[PDB]
Structure formats: C-alpha cells, structure tokens
Amino acid sequence: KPIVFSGVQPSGELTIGNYLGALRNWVKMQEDYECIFCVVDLHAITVRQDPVALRKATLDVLALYLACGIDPNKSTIFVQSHVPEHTQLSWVLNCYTYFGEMSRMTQFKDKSARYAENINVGLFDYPVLMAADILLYQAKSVPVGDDQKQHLEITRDIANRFNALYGNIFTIPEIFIGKAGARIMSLQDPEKKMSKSDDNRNNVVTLLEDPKSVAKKIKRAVTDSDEPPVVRYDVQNKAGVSNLLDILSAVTDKPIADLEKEFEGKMYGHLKTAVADEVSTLLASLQERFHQYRNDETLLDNILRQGAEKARAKAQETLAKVYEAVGFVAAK
Amino acid sequence: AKPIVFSGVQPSGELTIGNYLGALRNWVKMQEDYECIFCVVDLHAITVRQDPVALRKATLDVLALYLACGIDPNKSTIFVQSHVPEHTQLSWVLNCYTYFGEMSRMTQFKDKSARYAENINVGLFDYPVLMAADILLYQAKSVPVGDDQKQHLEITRDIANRFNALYGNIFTIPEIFIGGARIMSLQDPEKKMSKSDDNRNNVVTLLEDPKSVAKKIKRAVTDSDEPPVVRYDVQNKAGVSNLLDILSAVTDKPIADLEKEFEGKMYGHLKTAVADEVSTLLASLQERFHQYRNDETLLDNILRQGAEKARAKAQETLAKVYEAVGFVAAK
Ligand SMILES: N[C@@H](Cc1c[nH]c2ccccc12)C(=O)O
Ligand SMILES: N[C@@H](Cc1c[nH]c2ccccc12)C(=O)O
C-alpha cells in the first residue's frame, strides 16, 4: 500500500469545505493507501499561541478527524511533538539545506510582513521541519494546498541532495492529486474557496457550528440580483447561487440538475432553507460523534499512544539510516 | 546540591598537553565539587562537511581520551549529543522564541557569510540555538566557553530570560565558568599550543610516542641570553618560561621551586626534565586510553549509562517546556 502523509494544523475550525472536499475522500483512501495523519503542534508555535487553547485545539482536531471516520486501526494518527525523530531529522536536514533556499520562501516573506513583531527562527526553518515530517515515513505522496507547494518542492530538493551524497535513503515524495470532492466556495466571496483561516466568519460554516448559527450564515450567503430569481447553475453569472447548489448536492448526493427541477419557481430563500436544513443534518451527525470522542480523554490518550508508537517505529528505521550515513556513533 | 557545569566537547582524536594541562586536568579535579556534564557534540560537527568514518572515529577517540584523563562516568555525566533526542526537541521550541535578527547578527555567522556567501547552510545559522538547548536542558549554572563563544552564551541567556518572562522560572540562567597553565607552542612560544597546527613540532599530542616527545622538546626554541639562565619571564624568555610552565603543571612544583632546582644549570637540563616528566605522564594516559578505546563493549556501556542519565535530567526540563507552550503531553 502506498504511503500518504498529511500534516494537520491544530484548530478544529475545519469547515464544510474541508469535510466535503478533502476529509470525506481521506476516509475512503484508508482501504487502499497507508495514510498518516500528523497533528503539527511544533509548526503551530511558529506563531504565538495561547497555551491552553493550543492544547484544546490539538484534542479538538483529533476528535474531529475521528468523528469524520478516520480510523486509528486503519490509519496512523499522532501528535508531531510525541515523536522526537521529527526534530532529530530536521537538524540533520538543516545542515544540508542552503540558507538562501529558506530566505527565498514566499511563506516566510508573507508571515514576516504579517507578524513583524515575531520574526522568529522557527518561522524561517518551518520548511525543513516540514521536510523532516514527510521524509521520515518514506511517503510517496503528500497532499498540499497551492500555498504549500514551494515547501513540498524544497523537500524533494533536500531529499535528492542527501541521496546524491549518501545513497537512496529517502523516497522522493510527489504531490497527491485527489479524487477531488465538492467545490465549496466562500459564502460572501464566491470567487474564493472557503478557508479555515479566513477573518470574515460569514464566509465559512464550521463543522462544530450551531444549527441556528448555520442558518444565519446561509441566510446571508451572497446571491445575485437576477429578476425574477432563478435557481440555476452558472458559475460565471450566478456564483452565489451555484455555490449553494454545490453545497446542497454534496450533502444530499442529489445531482445538480435534479435540484434545479426541485427549485423551479422558488425564491433564493427556499434554497437557503434547504441548504441550512441539510447542512445542519450532516453536522448534527458529525457533532454527536465528536462529542463522544472529545469527552472520552482516556480513549484519546490511548489513540495517541498507539499512534505515536506506530509512528516512532517507522521514523526510527529512516533516522537510523541517516545517522549511520552522516557518521554518528549508533546508540547501543 | 552540587552546582552544575556543562561542557560541549567537539569530536577530536588530537588533544594536546595544552588541552590536558590547561582545562582537562582541572575538569577532572572539579568532579568532586561540581555536577559535571560532558556532551560530545556530534550534531554540531556536521554543520560543516564531515568524513563519516572520521567523525565516528573522532567521537570515540575523544570519549576514550576524556576517560583516560580521569573523567569518571560514575561521577560525571558523559555522553554523545546525538544519543539524547531532547537536544533537538528543545532547540525547535527555542527557535520559535529566538529572533531571526539575533542569529543574523552573530559574529560567527557574519564572518562565514562573508567567506561562503550563498553556499552557507541553515545549520551554521542555527548552531547557537542548538547550543542554547544543549546548556538549558540540564539546568546548567556554569559553562566554560572560549572568547569566540561568549556571544553564544549571551544569546542563550537572552533566550532563557525571554522564555522565563512568558512562562515562569523554567530555565536556570547560565553564566560563564570561573577559575590550568597556558601552554604555548614549542617553536613559536608567543602562540598558544593549538591541536590543529600544521607545524607538528609546535605541539605534543597526548597519544605521542616518548621518543617523539624528547625530539620536540629538545628542539623547542629558547633564547640566546648570555649567560643563559633558567628564569621565568614570559616577555623576554617565552620559550624557557613555557618549558618551566609545562614542567610546573606536570609535576605540581611551583615555578620558584623549579628556578631554584635549575640554579646554575643549562637549558638542556631543563629540556631533559620536561621530556622525562611529559613522557611519564603520556605513558600513563596512553595505557588508559588504549584500555578503554579498544574495549567496545565498555565504551557502549559507558555511552548508554551516559545517555540514560542525560535523558533523565533532560526530560525534567523538556516536560515543563512542552507543557508551558501548550502541547498535549504524551501519555
Ligand atoms: N505546512 C502545512 C502543515 C504541515 C506541516 N508538515 C507537513 C507535512 C506534510 C503536509 C503538510 C504539513 C500547512 O500549512 O497546513
Ligand atoms: N560551540 C562549542 C561546542 C558546544 C556545543 N554546545 C556547547 C555548550 C556549551 C559549551 C560548548 C558547546 C565549541 O565550538 O567548542
């Protein structure tokens, strides 16, 4: 089974876009791939975090993934900080990474502009730890957002460079191109994809979001001023209404054309009620499962222990080979 | 309640009598009054390109030299840096509380950046943060550092103070170690004896044959005073003063008592005594060196003991660091 590695930032402010697009897909990949889900708490502290909230958010993202159907008997799920080998590899890789390769990074330049009060070394060295996270597990494939591509490319360059000196120690990872799921746009900026990080909170629906809160957000979803109003799919002219239909289709599994028939002669209000009703049905189901997981702290600690254990065994195979190659005395 | 002193030891098979009579013989003695921690810094070694076979050799050579000199694994903690994962774990967290500008303005980085320009690696930039982690992990009160490493100790202190300010008194704030002879080069006695000198006649290494020793001592530069006199005067009689320093440090005889012993005698007598005393010392060190260095099982057990102790200490601090910043504790 091919190994797929994914880094997961701590939050549990996953949207219906994270779920309908990617997570639902991940759940099904479990059967045919060896999936590895790493909650990246070490990367999280590259920006100042409230400690109590980081701890809560780490557990929230874990329980959310479990609620969505990621199964720790089929996937390896763990917390980055529970596996020392991540940082151990990153130090070795820092030594084989050019300074100029980190300073040329788009992400470093952008986060430096946004957080000029905390331009730390962690922020600069982010990509090497990311490289280490992937290379430790000999991953063949890694899904990354468009913003994280330069990071996956530098990972490949470091691995090839190290392999050119010492032999084929690392698998050169490739971008994972998904089955692809629901196209889910921002509710007030249909031209942009709904995003975890967005400042305007009317753009997103969160997985843990309340039914009356969902209803408000959908109520104020941007729609065109066509007169009369008509519920028809047209991304060019009716991005607002088309998104609502993509959401409805995704959740109900009803073809878009059938939804058009259903809403012939209805107002945008009717379409918005259906979308809120159907999204809140899905979310009620997710949330009930989340609440079971999140409140069973003994279960969560056991899942994390099992997962870190599995992760450490695999990571150690790679790291030992690295440590042998560069010339370290092996611990006995 | 013994105060903790932390020293980073670069892998090397080439220590000299200047190393031994300067710092090392004193570290051996202070094992009684201090909690001494000796970390062989193999992770720092690879910030510059290393021969793997030579790195592995130099790691075990330096450990066996330390043991030979008297560093005792039941009294001190002696270990290989790469054997203790907590060093890299802490250094990541410290990166997140260390400003880019702080590393940018290190003198060592600027010098190397002018020399190597675009060829420099991230390791050389970040070296001081791992060094800070090395020290802070063990709650070290004192650290001996060279002049060229003073800036690295200052930034360690800044980082630790900063972290404490945010999260409470987690780190001890390290200070420079306070309180052997300054052994000079045999053919250029204004220069300190350096293990990495290209003139091998400048140096006596610890693993040197006693006939090679007599050769180098006989050839040591003196002066052309008329009359020649065995008298201590670093300015005017550097070479003779240096032989007197060697002899004094090796025998524990004060310089004034040696001056008396060599009253009316010649430089040749002084050189004979220095050669005889140094070769006696090195014989005894060499024998111990070969006993430990050839005994792989023993070296494995000593490194394992060392790493088990270092990990136990390191974890106390690292657990508090990981809790403070907000991580879920492994269970
Ligand atoms: N940088 C990723 C998170 C991440 C860390 N390590 C990774 C390794 C593989 C994929 C993703 C990651 C993000 O911004 O979300
Ligand atoms: N930088 C030191 C080696 C070292 C690494 N970590 C240390 C901690 C304390 C003292 C020295 C060190 C040297 O060049 O010699």
XYZ file of C-alpha atoms and ligand atoms in Angstrom:
693
model
C 0.000 0.000 0.000
C 1.417 3.433 -0.914
C 2.176 5.741 1.984
C 0.402 9.082 2.048
C 1.462 11.645 4.692
C -0.618 14.652 5.729
C 0.229 17.354 8.267
C -2.821 18.674 10.148
C -2.680 22.049 11.934
C -4.364 22.158 15.345
C -7.707 24.034 15.268
C -10.987 22.102 14.871
C -12.207 25.147 12.885
C -12.483 22.831 9.912
C -15.189 23.967 7.511
C -17.788 22.092 5.465
C -15.280 22.746 2.650
C -12.540 20.785 4.471
C -15.036 17.921 5.026
C -16.915 17.742 1.698
C -13.775 18.339 -0.375
C -10.900 16.524 1.243
C -11.772 14.669 4.546
C -14.575 12.560 3.063
C -12.051 11.466 0.413
C -9.414 10.664 3.051
C -11.859 8.376 4.853
C -12.173 6.220 1.712
C -8.417 6.253 0.933
C -7.843 4.313 4.165
C -8.640 0.999 2.446
C -6.147 1.425 -0.481
C -3.375 3.623 0.998
C -1.357 3.643 4.219
C -2.447 7.078 5.457
C -0.508 9.019 8.109
C -2.094 11.967 9.868
C 0.292 14.142 11.897
C -1.105 16.917 14.066
C 1.571 19.582 13.722
C 1.793 21.274 17.114
C 5.550 22.082 16.589
C 4.711 24.075 13.479
C 1.810 25.761 15.319
C 4.123 27.542 17.776
C 5.933 29.331 14.929
C 3.250 31.988 15.620
C 2.395 32.927 19.253
C -0.344 30.629 20.543
C -2.307 30.730 23.753
C -1.106 27.553 25.532
C -4.457 26.405 26.973
C -6.132 26.947 23.552
C -3.382 25.096 21.675
C -3.809 22.058 23.903
C -7.659 22.189 23.483
C -7.342 22.697 19.723
C -4.969 19.695 19.325
C -7.539 17.460 21.011
C -10.413 19.128 19.004
C -8.743 18.416 15.637
C -8.091 14.782 16.672
C -11.653 14.193 17.826
C -12.948 15.862 14.593
C -10.888 13.609 12.367
C -12.211 10.580 14.356
C -15.781 11.899 14.079
C -15.352 12.194 10.262
C -14.338 8.489 10.152
C -10.535 8.443 10.229
C -9.920 5.131 11.916
C -6.783 4.633 14.047
C -6.866 0.842 13.237
C -6.510 1.713 9.503
C -4.599 4.997 9.577
C -1.692 6.190 11.769
C -2.836 9.315 13.655
C -0.495 11.162 16.066
C 0.779 14.383 17.537
C 4.015 15.707 15.984
C 5.553 16.574 19.383
C 5.066 12.932 20.578
C 7.695 11.660 18.043
C 11.213 13.069 18.811
C 12.521 11.797 15.429
C 10.845 14.753 13.665
C 13.157 17.315 15.287
C 16.162 14.969 15.120
C 15.813 14.641 11.354
C 15.183 18.380 10.894
C 18.583 19.232 12.498
C 20.409 16.871 10.079
C 18.446 18.308 7.105
C 19.242 21.934 8.189
C 22.854 21.061 7.669
C 22.128 20.035 4.027
C 19.791 22.969 3.210
C 21.079 26.264 1.831
C 20.295 29.429 3.778
C 19.154 31.053 0.504
C 16.608 28.261 -0.024
C 14.801 29.300 3.161
C 15.111 33.056 2.691
C 13.573 32.839 -0.837
C 10.381 31.237 0.546
C 7.072 33.067 -0.266
C 5.564 31.974 3.046
C 8.467 33.311 5.127
C 8.264 36.672 3.305
C 4.488 36.881 3.875
C 4.421 35.834 7.548
C 7.359 38.263 8.148
C 5.210 41.131 6.785
C 2.120 39.985 8.814
C 3.965 39.245 12.141
C 6.969 41.671 12.042
C 6.854 41.692 15.911
C 7.781 37.939 15.959
C 10.008 37.165 13.006
C 11.462 34.079 14.685
C 13.882 31.355 13.551
C 11.082 28.796 13.734
C 9.202 30.721 11.072
C 12.344 30.728 8.850
C 13.082 26.988 9.427
C 9.426 25.842 9.059
C 10.091 24.179 5.628
C 12.944 21.909 6.949
C 10.814 20.550 9.769
C 8.110 20.027 7.177
C 10.635 18.155 5.020
C 11.524 16.019 8.034
C 7.877 15.295 8.854
C 7.416 13.774 5.303
C 10.759 12.059 4.682
C 10.769 10.138 7.976
C 7.862 7.940 6.814
C 9.129 7.306 3.295
C 5.936 8.858 1.973
C 5.337 8.522 -1.749
C 2.576 11.164 -1.799
C 1.673 14.339 0.079
C -1.421 16.498 -0.437
C -0.618 20.206 -0.136
C -2.645 23.384 -0.740
C -1.391 25.696 -3.523
C 0.314 27.862 -0.872
C 2.384 24.816 0.429
C 3.779 23.675 -2.986
C 7.110 25.518 -2.722
C 7.544 23.686 0.641
C 6.950 20.259 -0.943
C 9.369 21.189 -3.758
C 12.159 22.125 -1.311
C 11.507 18.787 0.474
C 12.213 16.983 -2.828
C 15.393 19.007 -3.456
C 16.757 18.251 0.050
C 15.984 14.547 -0.235
C 17.621 14.288 -3.682
C 20.675 16.245 -2.457
C 21.101 13.937 0.569
C 20.507 10.822 -1.524
C 23.158 12.032 -4.086
C 25.737 12.083 -1.277
C 24.808 9.009 0.748
C 22.655 6.598 -1.396
C 18.916 6.054 -1.678
C 17.965 6.776 1.872
C 14.818 8.904 1.163
C 11.730 8.327 -1.009
C 11.310 11.412 -3.185
C 7.684 12.433 -2.424
C 5.178 13.652 -5.074
C 2.142 15.923 -4.792
C -1.041 13.889 -4.171
C -3.731 14.763 -6.717
C -7.017 13.735 -5.116
C -10.167 12.090 -6.485
C -11.297 15.633 -5.718
C -14.545 16.343 -3.867
C -17.082 19.152 -3.581
C -16.141 22.590 -4.982
C -17.088 24.704 -1.874
C -16.703 28.478 -2.074
C -16.762 31.292 0.438
C -20.350 32.373 1.253
C -19.724 36.125 0.762
C -16.849 35.873 -1.759
C -17.991 33.060 -4.128
C -14.877 33.665 -6.260
C -12.696 32.294 -3.401
C -12.632 28.805 -1.872
C -13.863 28.576 1.735
C -10.853 28.577 4.059
C -10.011 27.535 7.681
C -8.129 30.822 8.331
C -10.499 33.464 6.977
C -11.163 36.665 9.038
C -14.672 37.199 7.752
C -16.502 34.399 9.617
C -19.681 34.835 7.498
C -17.639 33.179 4.647
C -17.465 29.797 6.385
C -19.531 27.136 8.018
C -17.594 25.307 10.687
C -18.204 21.633 11.450
C -18.929 22.326 15.137
C -21.234 25.231 14.311
C -24.678 25.547 15.837
C -27.887 24.878 13.737
C -29.185 28.462 14.325
C -25.686 29.776 13.531
C -25.538 27.699 10.305
C -28.980 29.107 9.373
C -27.815 32.730 9.819
C -24.671 32.223 7.702
C -26.589 30.615 4.832
C -29.357 33.265 5.119
C -26.689 35.952 4.444
C -24.963 33.985 1.629
C -24.381 36.321 -1.308
C -26.648 35.743 -4.277
C -27.175 37.663 -7.473
C -29.915 40.185 -8.249
C -31.450 38.241 -11.209
C -35.106 39.264 -11.622
C -37.128 37.076 -11.370
C -34.845 34.984 -9.120
C -33.996 31.559 -10.623
C -32.073 28.688 -9.162
C -29.793 27.573 -11.986
C -26.159 26.518 -12.091
C -23.952 29.183 -13.741
C -20.560 29.847 -12.130
C -19.786 32.831 -14.397
C -23.061 34.783 -13.757
C -24.518 33.240 -10.543
C -21.519 32.193 -8.387
C -23.520 32.779 -5.223
C -26.465 30.541 -6.177
C -24.227 27.936 -7.871
C -22.180 27.503 -4.659
C -25.433 26.942 -2.658
C -26.373 24.261 -5.191
C -22.866 22.645 -4.988
C -23.261 22.500 -1.193
C -26.774 21.049 -1.460
C -25.684 18.426 -3.990
C -22.632 17.482 -1.912
C -24.566 16.907 1.264
C -27.702 15.234 -0.173
C -25.949 13.374 -3.048
C -28.664 14.676 -5.428
C -27.488 15.649 -8.966
C -27.415 19.374 -9.584
C -29.933 19.058 -12.439
C -32.475 17.382 -10.119
C -32.074 20.255 -7.614
C -32.824 22.699 -10.447
C -36.134 20.927 -11.079
C -36.928 20.921 -7.363
C -36.407 24.691 -7.051
C -38.021 25.888 -10.364
C -40.247 28.808 -9.381
C -38.825 29.120 -5.824
C -37.053 32.094 -4.174
C -33.403 32.143 -3.055
C -34.890 31.972 0.489
C -36.314 28.437 -0.191
C -32.915 27.288 -1.499
C -31.183 28.765 1.553
C -33.597 26.977 3.976
C -32.938 23.649 2.309
C -29.159 24.158 2.326
C -29.179 25.150 6.058
C -31.519 22.256 6.919
C -29.388 19.688 5.052
C -26.015 21.038 6.249
C -27.285 21.051 9.867
C -28.457 17.418 9.482
C -24.962 16.331 8.367
C -23.346 18.427 11.066
C -25.623 17.117 13.880
C -24.400 13.630 12.968
C -20.703 14.713 12.978
C -21.092 16.683 16.149
C -22.698 13.818 18.120
C -19.729 11.568 17.223
C -17.264 14.398 18.008
C -18.804 14.867 21.428
C -18.447 11.161 22.270
C -14.738 11.191 21.268
C -13.795 14.567 22.668
C -15.147 13.774 26.165
C -13.519 10.344 26.431
C -9.998 11.599 27.342
C -8.806 8.064 28.153
C -9.734 6.996 24.607
C -7.928 9.976 23.086
C -4.723 9.345 25.095
C -4.821 5.668 24.053
C -5.285 6.517 20.368
C -2.406 8.960 20.573
C -0.153 6.497 22.382
C -0.847 3.714 19.853
C -0.343 6.173 17.006
C 2.910 7.671 18.315
C 4.207 4.153 18.866
C 3.491 3.153 15.267
C 4.958 6.450 14.037
C 8.136 6.115 16.108
C 8.873 2.566 14.780
C 8.753 3.735 11.166
C 10.535 7.009 11.748
C 13.363 5.168 13.598
C 14.053 2.959 10.540
C 14.740 6.027 8.461
C 16.547 8.087 11.124
C 18.980 5.267 11.978
C 19.991 5.046 8.329
C 20.501 8.816 8.240
C 22.561 8.799 11.435
C 24.695 5.888 10.080
C 25.273 7.727 6.775
C 26.474 11.057 8.241
C 28.857 9.277 10.623
C 27.270 9.226 14.086
C 28.188 6.534 16.631
C 24.980 4.445 16.909
C 23.395 4.313 20.354
C 23.609 0.784 21.719
C 23.202 20.114 45.979
C 26.326 20.390 43.682
C 26.418 23.228 41.084
C 26.012 22.032 37.510
C 28.680 22.777 34.898
C 28.012 21.878 31.220
C 30.753 21.500 28.623
C 30.356 20.762 24.928
C 33.237 18.664 23.620
C 33.998 18.644 19.849
C 34.765 15.175 18.449
C 38.580 15.011 18.043
C 41.391 12.427 18.292
C 44.112 15.145 18.530
C 44.207 16.652 22.038
C 47.496 18.109 23.234
C 49.280 18.538 26.546
C 47.958 22.118 26.379
C 44.410 20.771 26.457
C 45.261 18.407 29.317
C 47.334 20.793 31.454
C 45.072 23.747 30.637
C 41.457 22.785 31.093
C 41.095 18.943 31.272
C 43.175 18.065 34.296
C 41.193 20.759 36.192
C 37.781 19.447 34.971
C 38.903 16.074 36.373
C 39.588 17.625 39.796
C 36.367 19.624 39.990
C 34.277 16.384 39.625
C 34.374 16.408 43.417
C 32.738 19.803 43.945
C 30.627 20.142 40.744
C 27.994 18.091 38.884
C 29.950 17.958 35.604
C 28.191 17.186 32.274
C 30.342 16.397 29.195
C 28.391 16.236 25.931
C 30.271 15.116 22.784
C 28.729 17.424 20.201
C 28.424 15.272 17.048
C 25.327 17.202 15.888
C 27.241 20.442 15.861
C 30.142 18.742 13.984
C 28.003 18.218 10.802
C 27.284 21.988 10.311
C 30.434 21.684 8.201
C 31.043 18.819 5.860
C 32.423 15.733 7.710
C 34.048 12.491 6.677
C 31.630 9.960 8.208
C 34.424 7.432 9.059
C 36.488 10.168 10.635
C 33.536 11.625 12.624
C 32.678 8.221 14.108
C 36.383 7.647 14.975
C 36.842 11.120 16.497
C 33.662 10.697 18.630
C 35.039 7.508 20.251
C 38.633 8.866 20.419
C 37.549 11.984 22.381
C 35.430 9.877 24.770
C 38.316 7.454 25.389
C 40.737 10.449 25.878
C 38.436 12.021 28.483
C 38.093 8.723 30.341
C 41.897 8.259 30.141
C 42.442 11.701 31.633
C 40.247 10.803 34.650
C 36.718 11.924 33.745
C 34.724 9.360 35.648
C 31.275 8.201 34.329
C 30.039 7.438 37.896
C 30.924 10.984 38.980
C 30.236 12.937 35.803
C 27.652 12.539 33.075
C 29.498 11.909 29.766
C 27.517 11.255 26.611
C 27.133 11.689 22.821
C 24.782 14.553 21.858
C 23.018 12.558 19.079
C 22.058 9.895 21.609
C 19.726 12.266 23.510
C 16.717 13.266 21.316
C 15.779 16.049 23.811
C 18.553 18.291 22.473
C 16.861 18.739 19.037
C 13.362 18.841 20.639
C 14.270 21.767 22.845
C 16.213 23.527 20.074
C 12.971 23.571 17.931
C 10.980 25.211 20.691
C 13.841 27.713 21.286
C 13.876 28.546 17.565
C 10.291 29.754 17.994
C 11.391 32.208 20.753
C 14.611 33.350 19.027
C 14.530 36.352 16.609
C 15.854 35.943 13.081
C 17.901 39.145 13.740
C 19.587 37.599 16.778
C 21.014 34.791 14.643
C 21.701 37.183 11.713
C 23.978 39.347 13.845
C 26.121 36.597 15.404
C 29.741 37.395 14.548
C 30.482 33.803 13.642
C 27.642 33.828 11.057
C 28.620 37.145 9.530
C 32.266 36.011 9.150
C 31.153 32.755 7.480
C 28.543 34.587 5.421
C 31.263 36.918 4.026
C 33.521 33.934 3.223
C 30.885 31.491 1.786
C 28.144 33.897 0.646
C 25.364 31.783 -0.938
C 26.968 28.419 -0.044
C 26.159 28.581 3.689
C 23.734 26.014 5.227
C 20.928 26.545 7.748
C 22.914 24.528 10.359
C 25.597 27.221 10.582
C 22.861 29.857 11.057
C 21.005 27.947 13.754
C 24.073 26.465 15.593
C 23.665 28.919 18.527
C 20.082 27.818 19.234
C 21.096 24.131 19.499
C 23.939 25.278 21.752
C 21.391 27.071 23.950
C 19.238 23.951 24.122
C 22.397 21.879 24.950
C 23.011 24.068 28.003
C 19.437 24.865 29.145
C 18.225 21.296 29.051
C 20.419 20.357 32.098
C 19.752 23.448 34.251
C 23.431 24.286 33.993
C 24.645 27.129 36.200
C 28.071 27.482 34.563
C 29.583 26.916 31.118
C 33.184 27.272 30.017
C 33.289 28.939 26.671
C 36.089 30.375 24.539
C 36.287 34.095 23.792
C 34.834 33.332 20.362
C 31.822 31.599 22.075
C 30.959 34.440 24.532
C 28.299 35.756 22.199
C 26.625 32.312 22.079
C 26.387 32.297 25.894
C 24.871 35.822 25.845
C 22.124 34.756 23.424
C 21.459 31.587 25.450
C 20.832 33.884 28.459
C 18.566 36.211 26.433
C 16.513 33.322 25.126
C 16.178 31.738 28.576
C 15.228 35.101 30.210
C 12.678 35.736 27.498
C 11.132 32.271 27.893
C 11.041 32.603 31.714
C 9.360 36.015 31.418
C 6.489 34.430 29.473
C 6.139 31.112 31.231
C 7.651 31.254 34.737
C 11.032 30.190 36.006
C 11.647 27.163 33.842
C 15.352 27.665 32.928
C 18.379 28.328 35.038
C 20.229 31.306 33.637
C 23.737 30.095 32.752
C 26.939 32.110 33.478
C 30.483 31.814 32.248
C 32.569 29.310 34.138
C 35.028 30.963 36.594
C 38.504 29.843 37.863
C 45.428 25.356 34.367
C 48.599 26.653 32.724
C 48.547 28.418 29.350
C 50.796 26.067 27.361
C 52.481 27.670 24.338
C 53.804 26.382 21.031
C 57.290 24.860 21.159
C 58.597 26.601 18.008
C 56.558 29.835 18.358
C 56.073 30.369 22.115
C 54.161 33.616 21.662
C 51.422 31.375 20.161
C 49.137 29.149 22.260
C 49.621 25.398 21.568
C 46.791 24.543 19.082
C 45.765 20.936 18.347
C 45.198 21.975 14.691
C 48.624 23.421 13.928
C 50.227 22.472 10.608
C 53.689 22.615 12.287
C 53.577 19.335 14.251
C 56.804 20.452 16.052
C 54.665 23.104 17.768
C 52.572 20.512 19.594
C 52.821 17.482 21.836
C 49.684 15.320 21.431
C 48.535 13.038 24.177
C 48.987 9.921 22.073
C 52.622 10.667 21.219
C 55.471 8.310 21.458
C 58.073 9.232 24.210
C 60.916 9.337 21.661
C 58.835 11.722 19.514
C 58.305 13.707 22.743
C 62.007 14.012 23.540
C 62.620 15.125 19.902
C 60.159 18.000 20.054
C 61.228 19.174 23.492
C 64.947 19.115 22.518
C 64.074 21.304 19.519
C 61.920 23.769 21.437
C 63.050 27.359 20.959
C 64.757 29.054 23.852
C 66.707 32.344 23.772
C 70.286 33.416 23.261
C 70.796 35.075 26.664
C 74.428 35.265 27.727
C 74.731 33.849 30.311
C 71.739 31.542 29.687
C 69.637 31.143 32.810
C 66.585 29.111 33.767
C 64.362 32.011 34.929
C 60.632 32.693 34.482
C 59.978 35.700 32.230
C 57.182 35.360 29.652
C 58.051 38.591 27.857
C 61.781 38.162 27.483
C 62.177 34.357 27.763
C 58.973 32.946 26.266
C 60.478 29.631 25.275
C 62.261 28.868 28.583
C 59.245 30.243 30.528
C 56.978 27.835 28.610
C 59.148 24.813 29.359
C 59.045 25.894 33.015
C 55.177 26.112 32.758
C 54.968 22.652 31.270
C 57.246 21.191 33.959
C 55.389 23.016 36.757
C 51.951 21.853 35.578
C 53.008 18.274 35.021
C 54.834 17.923 38.401
C 52.814 20.386 40.507
C 56.046 22.127 41.502
C 55.734 25.947 41.839
C 57.832 27.923 39.358
C 60.032 29.469 42.106
C 60.978 25.953 43.367
C 61.945 24.956 39.776
C 64.022 28.080 39.343
C 65.854 27.019 42.484
C 66.223 23.428 41.287
C 67.746 24.652 37.944
C 70.051 27.268 39.572
C 73.338 27.309 37.539
C 72.035 24.602 35.179
C 71.535 24.795 31.435
C 68.559 24.760 29.047
C 69.493 21.176 28.122
C 68.905 20.048 31.725
C 65.532 21.811 31.740
C 64.631 20.176 28.374
C 65.672 16.757 29.686
C 63.461 17.112 32.770
C 60.490 18.366 30.682
C 60.838 15.428 28.230
C 61.163 12.846 31.034
C 58.166 14.181 33.040
C 55.922 14.612 29.992
C 56.735 11.086 28.675
C 55.962 9.593 32.081
C 52.520 11.331 32.082
C 51.680 10.380 28.464
C 52.642 6.671 29.074
C 50.142 6.510 31.852
C 47.443 8.325 29.789
C 48.152 6.272 26.668
C 47.774 3.000 28.574
C 44.452 4.025 29.975
C 43.447 5.344 26.529
C 44.198 2.030 24.839
C 42.426 0.074 27.610
C 39.121 1.938 27.061
C 39.393 2.668 23.341
C 39.931 -0.976 22.375
C 37.093 -2.191 24.623
C 33.954 -1.694 22.507
C 31.620 -3.279 24.999
C 32.841 -0.957 27.754
C 32.527 2.151 25.519
C 28.953 1.073 24.529
C 28.023 0.605 28.218
C 29.544 3.949 29.202
C 27.735 5.791 26.401
C 24.457 4.038 27.253
C 24.865 4.913 31.023
C 25.706 8.472 29.997
C 22.732 8.813 27.714
C 20.295 7.270 30.268
C 21.423 9.874 32.870
C 21.336 12.767 30.395
C 17.816 11.756 29.146
C 16.506 11.560 32.761
C 17.752 15.091 33.501
C 16.723 16.492 30.118
C 13.164 15.167 30.399
C 12.531 17.107 33.661
C 13.145 20.388 31.851
C 11.669 19.373 28.492
C 8.351 18.192 30.010
C 7.956 21.646 31.629
C 8.837 23.407 28.371
C 6.273 21.359 26.357
C 3.601 21.972 28.966
C 4.265 25.719 29.131
C 3.889 26.300 25.385
C 0.667 24.308 25.228
C 1.367 20.835 23.923
C -0.645 17.751 24.717
C 1.617 15.594 26.926
C 2.403 12.082 25.575
C 0.752 9.540 27.929
N 2.551 23.446 6.437
C 1.261 22.710 6.457
C 1.197 21.761 7.651
C 2.267 20.696 7.556
C 3.356 20.550 8.348
N 4.102 19.459 7.938
C 3.504 18.909 6.831
C 3.874 17.818 6.065
C 3.070 17.474 5.001
C 1.902 18.206 4.705
C 1.522 19.307 5.491
C 2.333 19.665 6.570
C 0.130 23.743 6.495
O 0.361 24.933 6.331
O -1.020 23.430 6.647
N 30.299 25.579 20.201
C 31.260 24.797 21.066
C 30.734 23.365 21.258
C 29.482 23.364 22.065
C 28.226 22.960 21.677
N 27.334 23.102 22.732
C 28.003 23.663 23.789
C 27.544 24.030 25.042
C 28.454 24.554 25.921
C 29.788 24.727 25.578
C 30.251 24.373 24.334
C 29.352 23.842 23.406
C 32.698 24.790 20.539
O 32.958 25.122 19.394
O 33.650 24.491 21.254
